[PDB]
């Protein structure tokens, strides 16, 4: 009779054991977390409520996320055995599998047309 979490059904913040065994280190860690959150909120609020502003507020978080998801991957990519095996299988295995199934299907079709046991009913526009 216990709730069992998942990556897709995460454990509740009121049910985690890490909160009831709280420490002064964790309390102060949340204190500077709130301090950084408040500093960023104050900066965005000032830039938002400035009436001299005539353009959108640029977001360094969005810029960093877009560059990390777009342009940093190949500078930060190093070939390992694992990603080489994964890239080889993900680039070849589906191609080989679909080639095999298409070749058997088309070979069966061509042989059936050649020796006559497949009758085309009204296939006039292929």
């Amino acid at each position: 009779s216990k709730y069992k979490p998942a990556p897709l059904a995460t454990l509740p913040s009121t049910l985690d054991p890490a909160e009831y065994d709280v420490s002064p280190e964790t309390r102060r860690a949340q204190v500077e977390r709130l301090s950084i959150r408040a500093r960023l909120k104050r900066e965005y609020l000032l830039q938002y409520n400035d009436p001299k502003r005539v353009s959108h507020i640029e977001d360094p978080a969005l810029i960093r996320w877009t560059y990390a998801r777009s342009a940093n991957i190949y500078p930060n990519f190093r070939p390992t055995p694992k990603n080489s095996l994964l890239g080889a299988v993900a680039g070849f295995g589906p191609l080989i599998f679909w080639y095999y199934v298409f070749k058997t299907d088309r070979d069966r079709k061509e042989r059936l047309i050649q020796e006559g046991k497949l009758d085309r009913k009204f296939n006039i526009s292929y």
Partner: protein, 170 residues
């Protein structure tokens, strides 16, 4: 009507006589008489006005015909002049055969819609005609490819003649 029953056959309609057993009036007959008097009469009046304007300005147009150039079987290879002429002839005959198949399919659709639940029995001749023209079309034009040509059709026909000749040996 610009169509004719020689290429669009249609059996004569056999409607039954009305026999109203009930004493109630027929709203269908009342509404169609009223609808005729209010809609069909002005529409047909303006249509006769338009048709008399057509008769005042009557013009004629003709159906173009092409003479039969010699076929590709008597065309020398590499001589692109006669090959082009036979290829254009083959393309025109291809389009004519396509419209022939369209005519047959429309005839089959008309048969099925007319017969309704009797289409399995009364449309036997139409389905047989469709099957025959389907088999002929498959034997002459199928599997030619996107770049279908008179040369490709001739090669397919020659292969069919060779295989049926080998079948005719035994």
């Amino acid at each position: 009507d610009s169509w004719d029953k020689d290429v669009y056959p249609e059996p004569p309609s056999r409607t039954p006589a009305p026999s109203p057993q009930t004493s109630l009036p027929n709203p269908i007959t009342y509404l169609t008489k009223a609808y005729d008097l209010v809609v069909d009469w002005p529409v047909t009046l303006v249509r006769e006005f338009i048709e008399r304007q057509h008769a005042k300005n009557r013009t004629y147009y003709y159906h173009r015909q092409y003479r039969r150039v010699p076929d590709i079987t008597e065309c020398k290879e590499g001589d692109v002049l006669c090959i082009y002429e036979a290829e254009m002839q083959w393309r025109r005959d291809f389009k004519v055969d396509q419209e022939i198949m369209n005519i047959i399919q429309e005839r089959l659709k008309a048969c099925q819609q007319r017969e309704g639940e009797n289409y399995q029995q009364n449309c036997a001749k139409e389905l047989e005609q469709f099957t025959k023209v389907t088999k002929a079309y498959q034997d002459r034009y199928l599997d030619l490819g996107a770049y279908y040509s008179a040369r490709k059709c001739l090669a397919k026909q020659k292969q069919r003649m060779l295989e049926e000749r080998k079948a005719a040996r035994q």
